Each structure stands twice: as structure tokens, then as C-alpha cells.
């Protein structure tokens, strides 16, 4: 268990010191899973990447070893709260139906898709394994497109909000931080609007670890900064790695979370 509690001054300077950031980052274990933990035949058709697999203790199981598998993990939130997010790979043609089965099974109210990563949402309507997916409205904003979706399976109807973030930067410099911070804030407000014990929020792009981990880590540290007046990005990254191997994949991503939190701290202090 690693930790470096940052007050405001050290946060601003830490985000701008790439040598210390890479020294710190590359001491965090990736906690990847041994591929021989999943010896099911035909399971490789359900993974985008051979070596990015779900840690077994936190794996989401659907309800046949193959039929119940999805490359997805429950992720703890701020203060260790269980099941605040699900981190998952972007669906492939072979798993689009499993993905929607997961959304239904978990009562997921919000999906966050992080692009600058797949194609699984319908033009108007589509159905998968008993659940009907209807896009009622599309809201275009500067930083994301929000789709208000209805899920129908039998007599039950549910709402769902799908956030498609389009401003993921190639160069992770501080000028590119505001859109991500805005997405984080809009999603956490939507989640509060669901009321007590919000069901898990699904986050993905391609492998479900890099951009995904940046988004979740920022979300966690925003609550930390508001409640405690500090941020601990190292401890947060360590908690995320225990839940799913590889969360926050690159040092550039690690620095980007520091840039976002440095921005948010300035905003809060005015
Ligand atoms: C700090 C960190 O990234 C970390 C600490 C401990 C750990 O092992 C937990 C396990 O599931 O065995 C993984 C990652
Ligand atoms: C965290 C890390 O390893 C890193 C961050 C930024 C950086 O500069 C980019 C460049 O190409 O100069 C190098 C390494």
C-alpha cells in the first residue's frame, strides 16, 4: 500500500515534474493476471488483448464457463466504497450482447465511453438477448455527446445515460485538462441524482485500463480534494491496480491526472 498525500503547493509542482512522476509511477506494480488463470477454450474470442484479463476476485460474472465471462471488473470508489464503477473493454462484435446483458444485470444507470473505441449503440432501436435498447434523445455539448436511452425487457423499463467523450488528447498537456474535468464533474452529479447506493457506473474505451483508469482516478480524487483538502493520486492508483491490473497504463496518463487535479484545486481556491 503506497501513498503520497499532496497539498496544493506540492500538487501544482508535482504535476510539472515528469522525472519524479516517472520514478514514482514505475514503482507501482501493474498487477496483471496470469493468462493461465483462464484456461477455458474459446475464451480468447472474448478478449481484445491476450494479456489484459480481469482479476478474478473482482471480476463481473454474467448469469457455462464461457457464457458467464466478460472482461470487466468491479472498481471501488472514494474511501473504498464497493462497486462504484465497472471498468471493461470496449465491446467487440463477439461481445456486444454480453455487454448489454451486464448493463441489465447490474442496473447500470450511466456509461462513460472515452474517445478522441467501438460501435454498440443503436441508431434508433436494437435488441440483444431479451433487452431492447432505444435512443430517445441526443444532446451535443462541447466536451461530450449525451444519449438518453431506454432499456425494455419484458414489463420492465429502465433509464440509462451514455456519455461519449470526444476530447481525449494525443498530447496530455495542461491545456487539454478542462474537458476531462468537466466530464468528471457532470458524471458525478448525474450519479448523485440517482440517489442512495447508485448502481455501478460502466467506464470503457479499448482495453478498459488506461483512459478508463485516468477517468476513475480523477473522479475519486475530486471527492478527496473536496472532503480532505488534499489529493493522494499514488494511493488511488494503487487501489485501482488492486481492483483491475494495469489501471492508468502510461506515465503520460499519470501526469495527466495530476494536471487535472492541479486545475481543479485552482478552481476551488478561486
Ligand atoms: C499499490 C498497488 O498498486 C498494489 C498493491 C497491492 C496489490 O496486490 C493485491 C492483490 O490483488 O494481490 C496490487 C497493487
Ligand atoms: C511521465 C513520463 O514518463 C513523461 C512525461 C512527459 C514527457 O515529456 C514528453 C516529451 O516527449 O518530451 C516524458 C516522459
From Swiss-Prot:
It is found in: Endoplasmic reticulum membrane. Residues 21-264 form the Tyrosine-protein phosphatase domain. The active site is at residue 205. It comes from the Eukaryota. Substrate binds at residues 170, 205-211, 249. Belongs to the protein-tyrosine phosphatase family. Non-receptor class subfamily. May regulate the activity of several effector molecules involved in synaptic plasticity and neuronal cell survival, including MAPKs, Src family kinases and NMDA receptors. This is Tyrosine-protein phosphatase non-receptor type 5. It comes from Homo sapiens. The lineage of its organism: Eukaryota, Metazoa, Chordata, Craniata, Vertebrata. The chain holds residues 282 to 561 of 565 of the full protein.
Amino acid at each position: 500500500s503506497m501513498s503520497r498525500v499532496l497539498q496544493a503547493e506540492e500538487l501544482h509542482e508535482k504535476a510539472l515534474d515528469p522525472f519524479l512522476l516517472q520514478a514514482e509511477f514505475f514503482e507501482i506494480p501493474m498487477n496483471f493476471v496470469d493468462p493461465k488463470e483462464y484456461d477455458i477454450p474459446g475464451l480468447v474470442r472474448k478478449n481484445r488483448y491476450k494479456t489484459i484479463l480481469p482479476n478474478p476476485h473482482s471480476r463481473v460474472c454474467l448469469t457455462d464457463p464461457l457464457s458467464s465471462y466478460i472482461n470487466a471488473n468491479y472498481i471501488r470508489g472514494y474511501g473504498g466504497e464497493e462497486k462504484v464503477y465497472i471498468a471493461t473493454q470496449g465491446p467487440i462484435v463477439s461481445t456486444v450482447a454480453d455487454f448489454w446483458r451486464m448493463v441489465w444485470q447490474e442496473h447500470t444507470p450511466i456509461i462513460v465511453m472515452i474517445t478522441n473505441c467501438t460501435e454498440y449503440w443503436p441508431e434508433e432501436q436494437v435488441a440483444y438477448d431479451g433487452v431492447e435498447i432505444t435512443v430517445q434523445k441526443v444532446i451535443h455539448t462541447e466536451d461530450y455527446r449525451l444519449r438518453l436511452i431506454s432499456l425494455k425487457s419484458g414489463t420492465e423499463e429502465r433509464g440509462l445515460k451514455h456519455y461519449w467523450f470526444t476530447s481525449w488528447p494525443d498530447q496530455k498537456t495542461p491545456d487539454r485538462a478542462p474537458p476531462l474535468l468537466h466530464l468528471v464533474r457532470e458524471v458525478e452529479e448525474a450519479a448523485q441524482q440517482e440517489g442512495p447506493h447508485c448502481a455501478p457506473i460502466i467506464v470503457h474505451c479499448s482495453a478498459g485500463i488506461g483512459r478508463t483508469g485516468c477517468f476513475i482516478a480523477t473522479s475519486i480524487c475530486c471527492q478527496q480534494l473536496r472532503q480532505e483538502g488534499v489529493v493522494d493520486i499514488l494511493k488511488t492508483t494503487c487501489q485501482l491496480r488492486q481492483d483491475r491490473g494495469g489501471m492508468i497504463q502510461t506515465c503520460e496518463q499519470y501526469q495527466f491526472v495530476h494536471h487535472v487535479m492541479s486545475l481543479y484545486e485552482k478552481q476551488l481556491s478561486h
